[PDB]
């Protein structure tokens, strides 16, 4: 779902004493208590759509001379510290999953509500795949460069 | 330069005789002229022979096809140079070995140009970078020289076939890679459509 | 590569007729998902297949696959003791003693009979791993003649002979981490080979098999112990990773079909 | 675009100034009567052709389709409806492959523009000029860029680093589906 | 390999044509092919499968096992002594000829990878060549030879795109 919505915070001397959530969405179980109080400070507006603008017309004239910078890919060397740094945080998540499977969130009397953060093995899978997809994404920008220019050679 | 090349080709076709012999020494002495293909094939320089007139014809052939060691072997038969004609011959020696091999080792240029160190050998190469003559990079680990851009010496009448051959592999080579990228998009999109249908029809029959 | 009662009987034919050639295409690739339709397997076939399959990898100098085959026959739960479970734990110690220096631990889902009944009955095999950690060839020879009556009544002859030569090969690899260029006369004291002439013949056997890389310096009477100068930068190493990853994406696809089948059937 | 009907000769002179900005412009004309099958619209392209010796810029109609992108159709339908859109497929893999698919199409057009330029100087179209030949000789001589022993020892080293990380990430995805199958099999089928 | 195809085609006829006891000439082909591939494990197990009534009646099988006995002990001077003693003029002769070339090739990859300073008096007993012929062939390759000591010093895109959609969805 394309989430989109404009709001406007009322200034001092015009805030309503009681106002329900005009545009209610999904909120994780952490900051849901502040949604029922801060909703009276602003209000949602009926968004519309139209075709005009002007900035989306001068970017083509620049691309005629700035096309040499759009091919500057090679993401494997740009944010190389973020890829290696993400493996250190994965080890802390994998260590928490070992204690989750050992203790178990299904006890006698009170089940599926023992530990605070459940499904640690399912959440650690997406974190491990994030370091894999981001690593192979930078390589695809380098292999595509060795197949169009490096495969030319000379007589 | 480029404006000076159209002035030397007009004065040589208007006069001949003793005036043509004096025009050859003025072109090699004046800088900016790095091409000698349009002046060697003309019939004005071919008529210079018998005596000192024949020495100017052999000197023009060495500046287009010969190299630096080819001039020191017959320096007594050819007229001497100055502080500007000798430095211009070293620029043509670098572009001569680049037309045959892609990378030239440092041991080859140290023997042809007769040097002792690497900075003095590369001192005559960096002077052609600011004049848009020789453009490339310097390698230190492999001790090679990857010449990317250089002068074509003459008008390129023999090695002109490599220009169309290199451009043909760049245009036709992109069609083979485009067929593989387009096929990968259709395979990745079809896998997502089949996975979304097999994950919704198996979960709806659990309640029934 | 499926498994059934017919595949279990094929491994028994290779034990009588000593010929491990037909047992190569049926054991080089791992098997999963047995062929079931009307009932064609039993609990006795799952223990006799892993026990007979471990003997093929043992003689073929394939200790990497023999340790995994003998581990499946032990983790199977049971109620009492059996001849197959007894021979599986006795061979698990002799195999692990050749690769490493200590016996590997058992998983959590293993049977309790192995740790309450098989363990006290296998006292002759548990004491063998204790002396192997000390690395002493003089004390290991006294345990062979002492436990000779136990190795004969349990048809385990020949398996314990490989552990005698493994201690001499382990002492040579141990000196590679500590020492670098040891003399030929000093190498015959710690490994105990009786004379420097017997030391030059034992180190030559490890070069042909590929267990360690060394060079004999006969000009100075010493021997050099270097490591393997392989940075794993050859293009052939990248093809091995791509070929091994083709089996991982297939195992996950097979588990997705079995997970959807259980979700269809009602459960608690 | 423009509003009128039949193609007029006055629109040819106006389309000539458009080619000076973009190398591949487009023409559009709205007709009140019918023409196509759906909306009465048609797209034309600037195609130059000689007519009895005089070169004129004619037009060529084309057949348009619908939305050819899943990541784009979800944004267009949410603009005209101004209400809500159904949940479909976002195609996260297609949003990243456009950086490499469009790069080949952009490079294939740049080589075609310079291929006929040098070929015309060798045949008989472009006059024989010594300046054009000396400026395009060493242009293609640099290919391939960095293809010696220095790049061969670095390209294989980077492929082995990310190749090993892919094996450790693939075994983690299999463990996620294995945990969902074990928990559903040790309860209904198994009782211990 | 060229010699690897003869071993696979020979074992198929051993478990199909005979019903219980095979023939002597076939046992000599499987044992000779196992000795060329330097596989002493499969060669030792194949020799034990032959009944004792066949070995005592056919003397040609005893000469093949005599050469394989020194291979298990890895004795280079003991290989050429057993080859030129018992030979068969049938199907083993074209196979035994290739076994002598594998012995010299095995010592070439073992001495040059474990003996950085081999003695010239002992190098002649590892390749079969005499002392006057072993010091001559090593000089044409690149190995040095000292004097007055007799010492020789020898020595992609299609796979990456499939893993993207597999891990994402």
Curated annotation (Swiss-Prot), chain B:
Give the main location.
Answer: cytoplasm
Put simply, this protein is called COP9 signalosome complex subunit 7b
Q: How does it assemble?
A: Component of the CSN complex, composed of COPS1/GPS1, COPS2, COPS3, COPS4, COPS5, COPS6, COPS7 (COPS7A or COPS7B), COPS8 and COPS9 isoform 1. In the complex, it probably interacts directly with COPS1, COPS2, COPS4, COPS5, COPS6 and COPS8. Interacts with EIF3S6. (Microbial infection) Interacts with vaccinia virus protein C9L.
Which residues belong to the signal peptide in this entry? none
The UniProt record lists the keyword Iron: no
Per the record, the similarity remark reads: Belongs to the CSN7/EIF3M family. CSN7 subfamily.
The alphabetized list of GO BP terms reads: COP9 signalosome assembly; protein deneddylation; regulation of protein neddylation
Swiss-Prot record, chain C:
Q: In which tissues is it expressed?
A: Widely expressed. Expressed at high level in heart and skeletal muscle.
What is the residue range of the signal peptide feature? none
Species, as recorded: Homo sapiens (Human)
The principal localisation class reads cytoplasm
Q: Which residues form the PCI domain?
A: 62-230
Describe its partners and assembly state. Component of the CSN complex, composed of COPS1/GPS1, COPS2, COPS3, COPS4, COPS5, COPS6, COPS7 (COPS7A or COPS7B), COPS8 and COPS9 isoform 1. In the complex, it probably interacts directly with COPS1, COPS4, COPS8 and COPS9 isoform 1. Interacts with CK2 and PKD. Interacts with the translation initiation factor EIF3S6 and IKBKG. Interacts with ERCC6.
Q: Which UniProt keywords apply?
A: Acetylation, Cytoplasm, Nucleus, Phosphoprotein, Signalosome
Described by its record, this protein's role is as follows: Component of the COP9 signalosome complex (CSN), a complex involved in various cellular and developmental processes. The CSN complex is an essential regulator of the ubiquitin (Ubl) conjugation pathway by mediating the deneddylation of the cullin subunits of SCF-type E3 ligase complexes, leading to decrease the Ubl ligase activity of SCF-type complexes such as SCF, CSA or DDB2. The complex is also involved in phosphorylation of p53/TP53, c-jun/JUN, IkappaBalpha/NFKBIA, ITPK1 and IRF8/ICSBP, possibly via its association with CK2 and PKD kinases.
Can you name this protein?
Answer: COP9 signalosome complex subunit 3
In its keyword annotation, does this UniProt entry include Coiled coil?
no
Question: Where does the record place it?
Answer: Cytoplasm; Nucleus
Q: Does this entry carry the keyword Acetylation?
A: yes
Also noted in the record is: Amplified and overexpressed in some osteosarcomas (OS), suggesting that it may participate in TP53 degradation in OS.
Swiss-Prot record, chain D:
GO cellular component terms, alphabetically, are: COP9 signalosome; cytoplasm; cytosol; nucleoplasm; nucleus; perinuclear region of cytoplasm
Q: Which GO terms describe its biological process?
A: protein deneddylation; protein neddylation; regulation of protein neddylation
Q: What does this protein do?
A: Component of the COP9 signalosome complex (CSN), a complex involved in various cellular and developmental processes. The CSN complex is an essential regulator of the ubiquitin (Ubl) conjugation pathway by mediating the deneddylation of the cullin subunits of SCF-type E3 ligase complexes, leading to decrease the Ubl ligase activity of SCF-type complexes such as SCF, CSA or DDB2. The complex is also involved in phosphorylation of p53/TP53, c-jun/JUN, IkappaBalpha/NFKBIA, ITPK1 and IRF8, possibly via its association with CK2 and PKD kinases.
Q: Which organism is it from?
A: Homo sapiens (Human)
Q: Name the coiled-coil region(s).
A: none
Q: State if Transmembrane helix is listed as a keyword.
A: no
Tissues expressing the protein: Widely expressed.
This protein is called what?
COP9 signalosome complex subunit 6
Instruction: Write out the similarity annotation.
Output: Belongs to the peptidase M67A family. CSN6 subfamily.
Where is it localised? Nucleus; Cytoplasm; Cytoplasm, Perinuclear region
Region Interaction with Vpr: list its residue ranges.
Answer: 87-192
Name of the gene encoding the protein in the UniProt record: COPS6
What does the UniProt keyword field contain?
Cytoplasm, Host-virus interaction, Nucleus, Signalosome
Where is it predominantly found?
Answer: nucleus
From Swiss-Prot, chain E:
Q: Which GO terms describe its biological process?
A: activation of NF-kappaB-inducing kinase activity; COP9 signalosome assembly; negative regulation of cell population proliferation; protein deneddylation; protein neddylation; protein phosphorylation; regulation of protein neddylation
Q: Which InterPro entries match?
A: COP9_CSN8, CSN8_PSD8_EIF3K, PCI_dom
Q: Where in the cell is it found?
A: Cytoplasm; Nucleus
Spell out the GO cellular component terms annotated for this protein, sorted alphabetically and separated by semicolons: COP9 signalosome; cytoplasm; cytosol; extracellular exosome; nucleoplasm; nucleus; perinuclear region of cytoplasm
Instruction: State the Pfam families in the record.
Output: CSN8_PSD8_EIF3K
For whether the record's keyword set contains Endoplasmic reticulum, the answer is: no
Family according to the record: Belongs to the CSN8 family.
Q: What protein does this entry describe?
A: COP9 signalosome complex subunit 8
Q: Print the organism lineage.
A: Eukaryota, Metazoa, Chordata, Craniata, Vertebrata
Query: Which gene is the coding source of this polypeptide chain?
Result: COPS8
């Amino acid at each position: 779902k394309v989430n989109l919505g404009a709001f406007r915070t009322y200034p001092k001397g015009y805030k309503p004493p009681d106002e329900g959530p005009s545009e209610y969405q999904t909120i994780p179980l952490n900051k849901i208590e502040d949604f029922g109080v801060h909703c009276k400070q602003y209000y949602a507006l009926e968004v519309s759509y139209f075709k005009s603008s002007l900035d989306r017309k001068l970017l083509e004239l620049l691309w005629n001379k700035y096309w040499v910078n759009t091919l500057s890919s090679s993401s494997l060397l740009t944010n190389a510290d973020y890829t290696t740094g993400q493996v250190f945080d994965l080890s802390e998540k994998l260590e928490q999953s070992e204690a989750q499977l050992g203790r178990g969130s299904f006890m006698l009397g009170l089940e599926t509500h023992d530990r605070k953060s459940e499904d640690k093995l399912a959440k650690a899978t997406r974190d491990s795949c994030k370091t894999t997809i981001e690593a192979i994404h930078g390589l695809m920008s380098q292999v595509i460069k060795d197949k169009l220019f490096n495969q030319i050679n000379i007589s | 330069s480029s404006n000076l090349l159209e002035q030397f080709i007009l004065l040589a076709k208007g006069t001949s005789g003793s005036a043509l012999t004096a025009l050859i020494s003025q072109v090699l002495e004046a800088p900016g002229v790095y091409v000698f293909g349009e002046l060697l094939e003309l019939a004005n320089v071919q008529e210079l022979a018998e005596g000192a007139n024949a020495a100017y014809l052999q000197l023009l052939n060495l500046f287009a096809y010969g190299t630096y060691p080819d001039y020191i072997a017959n320096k007594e038969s050819l007229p001497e140079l100055s502080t500007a004609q000798q430095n211009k011959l070293k620029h043509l020696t670098i572009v001569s070995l680049a037309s045959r091999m892609k990378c030239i080792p440092y041991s080859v240029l140290l023997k042809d140009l007769e040097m002792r160190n690497l900075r003095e050998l590369e001192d005559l190469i960096i002077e052609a970078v600011y004049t848009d003559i020789i453009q490339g990079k310097l390698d230190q680990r492999n001790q090679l020289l990857e010449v990317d851009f250089c002068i074509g010496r003459d008008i390129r009448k023999k090695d002109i076939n490599n220009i169309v051959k290199t451009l043909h592999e760049w245009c036709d080579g992109c069609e083979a890679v485009l067929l593989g990228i387009e096929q990968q998009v259709l395979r990745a999109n079809q896998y997502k459509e089949n996975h979304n249908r097999t994950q919704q029809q198996v979960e709806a029959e659990v309640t029934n | 590569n499926q498994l059934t009662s017919i595949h279990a009987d094929l491994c028994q034919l290779c034990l009588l007729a000593k010929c491990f050639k037909p047992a190569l295409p049926y054991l080089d690739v791992d098997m999963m998902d047995i062929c079931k339709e009307n009932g064609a397997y039993d609990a006795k076939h799952f223990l006799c297949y892993y026990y007979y399959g471990g003997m093929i990898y043992t003689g073929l100098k394939n200790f990497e696959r023999a340790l995994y085959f003998y581990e499946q026959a032990i983790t199977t739960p049971a109620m009492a003791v059996s001849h197959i479970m007894l021979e599986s734990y006795k061979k698990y110690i002799l195999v692990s003693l050749i690769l490493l220096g200590k016996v590997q631990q058992l998983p959590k889902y293993t049977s309790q009979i192995v740790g309450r009944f098989i363990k006290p009955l296998s006292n002759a095999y548990h004491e063998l791993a204790q002396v192997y950690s000390t690395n002493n060839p003089s004390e290991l020879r006294n345990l062979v003649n002492k436990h000779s009556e136990t190795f004969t009544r349990d048809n385990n002859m020949g398996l314990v002979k490989q552990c005698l030569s493994s201690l001499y090969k382990k002492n040579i690899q141990r000196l590679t981490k500590t020492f670098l260029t040891l003399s030929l006369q000093d190498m015959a004291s710690r490994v105990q080979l009786s004379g420097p002439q017997e030391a030059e013949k034992y180190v030559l056997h490890m070069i042909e098999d590929g267990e360690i890389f060394a060079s004999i310096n006969q000009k100075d009477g010493m021997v050099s112990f270097h490591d393997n100068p392989e940075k794993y930068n050859n293009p052939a190493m990248l093809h091995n990773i791509d070929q091994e990853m083709l089996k991982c994406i297939e195992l996950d696809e097979r588990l997705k079909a079995m997970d959807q089948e259980i979700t269809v059937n009602p459960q608690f | 675009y423009t509003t009128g009907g039949p193609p007029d000769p006055s629109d040819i002179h106006v389309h000539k100034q458009v080619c000076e900005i973009i190398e591949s412009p487009l023409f559009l004309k709205l007709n009140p009567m019918t023409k196509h099958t759906d909306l009465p619209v048609s797209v034309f392209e600037s195609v130059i052709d000689i007519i009895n010796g005089e070169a004129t810029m004619l037009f060529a109609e084309l057949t348009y389709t619908l939305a050819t992108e899943e990541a784009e159709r979800i944004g267009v339908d949410h603009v005209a409806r101004m209400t809500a859109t159904g949940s479909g497929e976002n195609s996260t893999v297609a949003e990243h492959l456009i950086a490499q698919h469009s790069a080949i199409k952009m490079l294939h057009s740049r080589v075609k523009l310079i291929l006929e330029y040098v070929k015309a100087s060798e045949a008989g179209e472009v006059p024989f000029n010594h300046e054009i030949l000396r400026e395009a000789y060493a242009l293609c001589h640099c290919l391939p860029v960095l293809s010696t022993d220095k790049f061969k020892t670095d390209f294989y080293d980077q492929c082995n680093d990310v190749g090993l990380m892919a094996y450790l990430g693939t075994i983690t995805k299999t463990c996620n589906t294995m945990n969902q199958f074990v928990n559903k099999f040790n309860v209904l089928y198994d009782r211990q | 390999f060229s010699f690897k195809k003869l071993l696979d085609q020979c074992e198929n006829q051993e478990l199909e044509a005979p019903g219980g006891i095979a023939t002597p000439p076939v046992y000599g082909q499987l044992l000779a092919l196992y000795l060329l591939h330097n596989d002493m494990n499969n060669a030792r197990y194949l020799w034990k499968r032959i009944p004792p009534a066949i070995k005592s009646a056919n003397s040609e099988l005893g000469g093949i096992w005599s050469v394989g006995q020194r291979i298990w002990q890895r004795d280079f001077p003991g290989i050429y002594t057993t080859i030129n003693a018992h030979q068969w003029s049938e199907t083993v002769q074209p196979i035994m000829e290739a076994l002598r070339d594998a012995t010299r090739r095995r010592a070439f990859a073992l001495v040059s990878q474990a003996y950085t300073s081999i003695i010239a008096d002992d190098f002649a007993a590892f390749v079969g060549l005499p002392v006057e012929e072993a010091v001559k062939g090593i000089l044409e390759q690149g190995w040095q030879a000292d004097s007055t000591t007799r010492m020789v010093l020898p020595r992609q895109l299609a796979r990456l795109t499939d893993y993207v959609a597999f891990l994402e969805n």
